[PDB]
């Protein structure tokens, strides 16, 4: 059993080489192949290439041939795929999956995944809208307070209450694409306590391009 | 490369009812060479059946794998909110291996009346950017719902953007948030902001009130 | 006839034909298959055609002409390293031939295939040791690889039973485009006994050695260890044959 993890989501211009890295925790590589799968949003998964680090062999699908170079080092225990001159339409989530072998082409475990974005525009840091807790709410049963995230060009910013300590009563909404290139997503939590909540720290926001963490405390207005 | 037909997708299924997913293949493929992958919303796919028969380790026997050669059916003896997900059948008999178009299983435990919360724009939003307005429909089942914004107790065009949170694995609770975006400078004539929800849950359109 | 029968195997799955005490004709084999490439090591090809050895070993497999250079003991190419090895100590004659259209009862394999790499992972997953084929032996990783490799890039792995050694054995399968005409590679290793040379080329009686040619002439006869001076005359058969 080897756990599979993938690099943080990155945004690159189209025609600029982009590298996605898959690593195994504990710096240990078993005798298993690494397979790269590209899934377009709301589309079937596509197998870009199959490589085995221990064997050192490299194989690619016919559609992705001569534009992608795949390198897996068994000693490093990290497998990295480099894609060059990719089209703007190519943007999709990328996954690394463990491979039993040519005899058994099924993936027991899958990587968390890396979102690859290829737009020649600008990257905008996320702006946190006020929590603005609802004036009318149950006095003790529940309190509705959400810090909205808006004005972020590159998906996906991850925002969690109590810095991810609280996984209960927190709702995460997928970003909705408006006519403007920038898009917004919603994070809201329901707490029995009217103010403060389980812990003083709340509304942690993390943006993969920004690499900045900000925590704000709700005020009942 | 084999083109493969798939189950239509979204279906309304009661818990405890057997569910069958069809994976017909235009070109014949090996009976022992097919895989089933289940992905929760915002989750990586996990193998359920390998070889189109044996269950993967750590996978419940309820998702049994049946069918061979051309048509492969995945049958679930008992249906749970955790079970609801997107299912893909991948045929690895022919290379390149082709993943399924996918099918969506939906489990609704019960009809839930929507809870409507209106978030009034705060002073900080008035100070910078766009104040905007936010409406929430927590615990609304089914997830699909219609909300129309009301400005100063007058009809407002539905340019509001609505998104639905992923269903909880056990709770299976769906929340819809509709947000209307307006320039911070243009906030004078309107005194009341409300969202009107038409849904199976609740007796009538549950409108709301801002004032402040 | 066994070489002609059925279909030639892959270089890793090469079959072995052994001849110890029989008359052999190199020309007859050359007549059966046109020889695209002829080479020999440690002896002349003409000498191999007409000489006596203790034993003759023939290895027959389907090998394309393009990768013939890779399959050499001197060559460091992977196909020689992980598939078929010919012993250096015995003189080795290597012949590559292309089947004639006229020839029949020869079956072409779907594609020529070879083991790209043969290696065994150690007990530690981090440490791996490569396995190099010993002379002949049908290849170490041959069992994992199928007789014909389905895809140009393939991964084969199997688990050794613990003690010994409990280490995964890994093989690579590679294929090349099938030639319009089947090409077969033959490796011959010959062992010479100092006092024993059982296998010899076909022998045709010389006119002087034959009794019929020298009939009516005083001659010295040395038949089956009997030596005398006598004249042979053809006559009606008498006594026991």
- Give me C33's structure tokens: 């298959």
Query: Which of C78, C58, C44, C83 has the alpha carbon at shortest distance from C4?
Result: C58
Q: Compare CB distances from A28 to C116, C126, C173 and report the shortest one's residue.
A: C126
Terminal Cα-to-Cα distance of chain C (whole angstroms): 33
User: What is the three-state SS of chain C?
Assistant: CCCCCCCCCCCCCCEEEEECCCEECHHHHHHHCEEEEEEEECCCHHHHHCCCECEEEEEEECCCCCCCCCCCCCCCCHHHHHCCCCCCCCCEEEEEEECCCCCCCCCCCCCEEEEEEEEEECCCCCCEEECCCCCCCCCCCCCCCCCCCCCCCEEEEEECCCCCCCCEEEEEEEEECCCCCCEEEEEEEEECCCCCCCEEECCCCCCCCCCCCCCCCEEEEEECCEEEEEECCCCCCCCCC
CA distance C174 to C112: 9
Whether the CB-CB separation of C181 and C109 falls below 8 Å is answered with no
CA dihedral (B137, B138, B144, B149) in degrees, to 10, reads 10
> Do B125 and B88 fall into the same domain?
no
Residue A55 touches partner C, C-beta closer than 8 Å: yes
Method: cryo-EM
Chain A, chain C: beta-carbon pairs less than 8 Å apart: 49
Which DSSP string corresponds to A5-42?
A: EEPPPEE--TTS-EEEEEEETTS---S-EEEEEEE-TT
Please give, rounded to a whole number of angstroms, the shortest distance from the CA of A53 to a CA of chain C.
11
Closest CA to B88 of A53, C227, A42, C78: A42
Nearest alpha carbon to residue A100 among C113, B92, C125: B92
* Residue B1 within a domain: no
Same domain, B89 and B148: no
Return left, alpha or beta for B67; rule: phi > 0 is left, psi -120 to 50 is alpha, else beta. Answer: left
In the block, residue with structure tokens 């070109």: B27
Which chain A residues have a beta carbon less than 8 Å from that of B184?
A: none
Q: Is the CB of A31 inside 8 Å of chain C's CB atoms? A: yes
CB contact under 8 A, B122 and A130: yes
Q: What angle do CA B171, B173, B175 make, to 5 degrees?
A: 155
Q: Do B128 and B53 fall into the same domain?
A: no
- Distance between CA atoms of residues C235 and C217, nearest Å: 15
Q: How far is B50 from chain A (nearest CA, A)?
A: 7
Domain count within chain B:
2
Whether residue B2 lies inside any domain: the answer is: no
Per the omega criterion (within 30 degrees of 0), is the bond before C165 cis? Answer: yes
Which contacts qualify for C70-79: CB closer than 8 Å, 24 or more apart?
C71/C11, C71/C185, C73/C41, C78/C114, C78/C116, C78/C117, C79/C11, C79/C114, C79/C115
Separation of CA C182 from chain center: 17
**Interface of chain A against chain B, CB under 8 Å?**
37, 44-47, 61-62, 95, 104-108, 110-113, 127, 129-137, 144, 146, 148, 150-151, 171-176, 178, 184-186, 188, 190, 221
CB atoms B42 and A174 under 8 Å: yes
DSSP annotation of A208: T
**Is B206 part of a structural domain of the chain?**
no
Helices (H) and strands (E) in chain A, counts: 0, 19
| B146 and B95 in a common domain | no
Same domain, B95 and B15: yes
Verify whether the Cβ–Cβ distance C155 to A99 is below 8 Å: yes
Domain boundary (B84, B107, B130) is at B107
Q: What contacts B6, CB < 8 A, 6 or more positions away?
A: B22, B23, B89, B100, B101, B102, B103
Q: How many residues does chain C have?
A: 241
The token pair at B162 is 């609505």
Structure tokens at B155: 């009809």
- Cβ-count burial A1-21 (b if 16+ within 10 Å, e if not): eeebebbebbbbebeeebbbb
The residues that bridge with A19 in the sheet, in sequence order, are A82
Q: State how far residue A57 is from chain C, nearest Cα, in angstroms.
A: 8
- Domain harbouring B169, CATH code: 2.60.40.10
Yes or no: say if A147 and A128 are a contact pair by the CB < 8 Å rule: yes
Name the helix (H) or strand (E) containing A213.
Answer: strand A213-214
CA distance A85 to chain B (A): 22
Asked, for residue B209, whether it belongs to a domain, the answer is no
Residues in chain A with CB shorter than 8 Å from the CB of B119 are 132-134, 144, 146
Picking from A31, A58, A102, the nearest residue to C154 by CB comes out as A102
Instruction: State the smallest CA–CA distance between residue C176 and chain A in angstroms.
Output: 15
C-beta of residue C41 within 8 angstroms of C-beta of residue C94:
yes
Residue B5 lies in a domain: no
Q: Say how many CB pairs under 8 Å bridge A and B.
A: 124
**Order of strands, edge to edge, in the sheet holding B19-24?**
B19-24, B71-76, B63-68
CB-based contact B134 A127, cutoff 8 Å: no
- The answer to whether residues B93 and B145 belong to one domain is no
**A197 with A218: CB under 8 angstroms?**
yes
User: Do the chains contact at A101 and C157, CB–CB below 8 Å?
Assistant: yes
DSSP chain B: ---B------EEE-TTS-EEEEEEBSS---TT-EEEEEE-TTS--EEEEETTTEEPTTS-TTEEEEEETTEEEEEESS--TTT-SEEEEEE-SSSS-B----EEEEE-SS-BPPEEEEEPPPHHHHHSS---EEEEEET-BSS--EEEEEETTEE--S--EEEEPPPPTTT----EEEEE---SS--SS---EEEEEE-SSSSS-B------
Residue B45 lies in a domain: yes
C-alpha–C-alpha distance, residues A29 and C124, integer Å = 10
DSSP A68: E
* Same domain for B193 and B133: yes
- β-strand partners of A188: A171
Query: How far apart are the two ends of chain B, measured CA to CA in Å?
Result: 62
Q: B119 vs A144: CB contact, 8 Å cut-off?
A: yes
Residue B132 lies in a domain: yes
Clarify whether residues B129 and B159 are in a common domain: yes
Quick one: closest CA in B to A108, which residue?
B47
Q: Identify the DSSP state of A88.
A: G
Region of residue B109 (left: phi > 0; alpha: psi -120 to 50; beta: else): alpha
The shortest C-alpha distance from A1 to chain C (Å) reads 12
Chain A residues inside the 8 Å CB shell of B209: 136
Are A172 and B88 in contact (CB < 8 Å)?
no
- As a whole number of angstroms, the distance between CA B53 and CA B34 comes to 9
On whether both B168 and B103 belong to a single domain, the answer is no
Please name each of the domains of chain A with its CATH number: 4-117 (2.60.40.10), 127-215 (2.60.40.10)
Using DSSP bridges, classify how beta strands C218-223 and C226-231 pair: parallel, antiparallel or unpaired.
antiparallel
Claim to verify: residue B30 and residue B46 sit in the same structural domain: yes
Interface touch A47/B166, C-beta < 8 Å: no
SS3 state of residue A172: strand
* Helix (H/G/I), strand (E/B), else coil: A162: helix
Q: In the numeric block, which tokens belong to residue A57?
A: 């062999």
3-state secondary structure of A206: strand
Resolution value (Å, 1 decimal): 2.5
B132 neighbourhood in chain A, CB within 8 Å: 129, 148, 150
Contacts of A54-58 spanning 24+ positions with Cβ under 8 A: A54/A29, A54/C119, A54/C121, A54/C128, A54/C170, A55/C117, A55/C119, A55/C155, A55/C170, A55/C172, A56/C117, A57/C116, A57/C117, A57/C153, A57/C155, A57/C172, A58/C153
Is residue C124 exposed (0-12), middle (13-18) or buried (19+ Cβ within 10 Å)?
Answer: exposed
CB C174 within 8 A of CB C11: no
Which are the contacts of C44, defined by CB distance < 8 A and separation ≥ 6?
none
d(CA B145, CA B112): 12
Which of these three, B60, B82, B107, is where a domain ends?
Answer: B107
One domain for residues B133 and B96: no
d(CA B48, CA A36): 19
Which residue among B107, B126, B142 closes a domain? B107
Domain that holds residue B58: 11-107
Nearest-angstrom CA–CA distance, A170 and A93:
24
Is A57–C119 a contact, with Cβ atoms under 8 angstroms apart?
no
What span, in angstroms and rounded, lies between the C-alpha atoms of C41 and B102?
Answer: 61
d(CA A195, CA A182): 32
- Closest by CA to A85, choosing from A10, A9, A18, A8, is A18
Q: How many CB atoms lie within 10 A of CB B126?
A: 14
Nearest to A108 among B56, B177, B181 (CB): B56
Within 8 A of A58 by CB-CB distance, chain C residues are 153
From chain A, pick out residues whose CB is under 8 angstroms from the CB of B125: 129-130, 132
Do B124 and B187 lie in a common domain? yes
Nearest to A186 among B45, B125, B177 (CB): B177
| Interruptions in chain B after residues (C–N over 2.5 Å) | none
Pairwise CA distance, residues C140 & C123, whole Å: 18
Whether B94 is covered by a domain: the verdict is: yes
- Cis, bond preceding B25 (omega within 30 deg of 0): no
């Amino acid at each position: 059993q080897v756990q599979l993890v993938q690099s943080g989501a990155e945004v690159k211009k189209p025609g600029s080489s982009v590298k996605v890295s898959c690593k195994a925790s504990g710096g240990t590589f078993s005798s298993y192949g690494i397979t790269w799968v590209r899934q377009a949003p709301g589309q079937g998964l596509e197998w870009m290439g199959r490589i085995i680090p221990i064997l050192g062999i490299s194989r690619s699908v016919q559609k992705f041939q001569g534009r992608i170079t795949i390198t897996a080092d068994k000693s490093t225990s990290t497998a990295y795929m480099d894609l060059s001159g990719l089209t703007s339409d190519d943007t999709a989530v990328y996954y690394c999956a463990r491979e039993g072998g040519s005899g058994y082409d099924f993936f027991d475990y899958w990587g968390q995944g890396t979102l690859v974005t290829v737009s020649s525009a600008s990257t905008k840091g996320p702006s946190v809208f006020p929590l603005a807790p609802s004036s009318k709410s149950t006095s003790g049963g529940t309190a509705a307070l959400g810090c909205l995230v808006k004005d972020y060009f590159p998906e996906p910013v991850t925002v969690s209450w109590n810095s991810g300590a609280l996984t209960s009563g927190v709702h995460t909404f997928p970003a909705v694409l408006q006519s403007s290139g920038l898009y917004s997503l919603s994070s809201v939590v329901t707490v029995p306590s009217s103010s403060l909540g389980t812990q003083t720290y709340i509304c942690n926001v993390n943006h993969k391009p920004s690499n900045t963490k900000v925590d704000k405390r709700v005020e009942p207005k | 490369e084999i083109v493969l037909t798939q189950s239509p997708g979204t279906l309304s299924l009661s818990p405890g009812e057997r569910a069958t997913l069809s994976c017909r293949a235009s070109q014949s493929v090996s009976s022992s060479y097919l895989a089933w992958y289940q992905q929760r919303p915002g989750q990586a796919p996990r193998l359920l059946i390998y070889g189109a028969s044996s269950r993967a380790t750590g996978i419940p026997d309820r998702f049994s794998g049946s069918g061979s050669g051309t048509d492969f059916t995945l049958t679930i003896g008992r249906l749970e909110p955790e079970d609801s997900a997107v299912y893909y059948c991948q045929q690895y008999g022919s290379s390149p291996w082709t993943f399924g178009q996918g099918t969506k299983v939906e489990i609704k435990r019960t009809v839930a009346a929507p809870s409507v919360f209106i978030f009034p724009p705060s002073d900080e939003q008035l100070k910078s950017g766009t104040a905007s307005v936010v409406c929430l429909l927590n615990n609304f089942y089914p997830r699909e719902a219609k909300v129309q914004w009301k400005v100063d107790n007058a009809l407002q065009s539905g340019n509001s953007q609505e998104s639905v949170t992923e269903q909880d694995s056990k709770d299976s609770t769906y929340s819809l948030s509709s947000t209307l975006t307006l320039s911070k400078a243009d906030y004078e004539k309107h005194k009341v902001y409300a969202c009107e929800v038409t849904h199976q849950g609740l007796s009538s359109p549950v409108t709301k009130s801002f004032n402040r | 006839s066994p070489l002609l029968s059925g279909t030639p195997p892959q270089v890793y799955n090469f079959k072995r034909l052994v001849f110890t005490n029989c008359n052999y004709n190199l020309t007859k084999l050359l007549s059966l298959f046109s020889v695209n490439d002829f080479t020999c090591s440690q002896i002349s090809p003409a000498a191999i055609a007409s000489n006596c050895y203790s034993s003759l070993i023939l290895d027959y497999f389907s090998y394309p002409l393009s990768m013939k250079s890779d399959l050499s003991v001197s060559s460091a190419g992977p196909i020689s390293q992980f598939n078929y090895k010919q012993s250096f100590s015995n003189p080795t004659c290597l012949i590559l031939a292309t089947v004639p259209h006229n020839l029949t009862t020869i079956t072409k394999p779907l594609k020529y295939s070879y083991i790209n790499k043969c290696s065994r992972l150690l007990s530690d997953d981090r440490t791996e040791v490569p396995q190099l084929v010993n002379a002949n032996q049908y290849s170490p990783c041959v069992s994992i690889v199928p007789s014909t490799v389905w895809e140009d890039g393939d991964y084969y792995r199997k688990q050794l039973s613990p003690l010994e050694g409990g280490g995964w054995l890994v093989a690579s399968g590679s294929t090349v485009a099938m030639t319009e005409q089947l090409q077969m590679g033959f490796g011959i290793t010959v062992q010479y006994g100092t006092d024993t040379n059982s296998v010899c080329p076909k022998l045709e009686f010389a006119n002087d050695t034959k009794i019929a040619s020298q009939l009516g002439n005083c001659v010295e006869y040395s038949l089956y260890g009997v030596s005398g001076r006598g004249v042979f005359q053809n006559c009606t058969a008498v006594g026991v044959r």
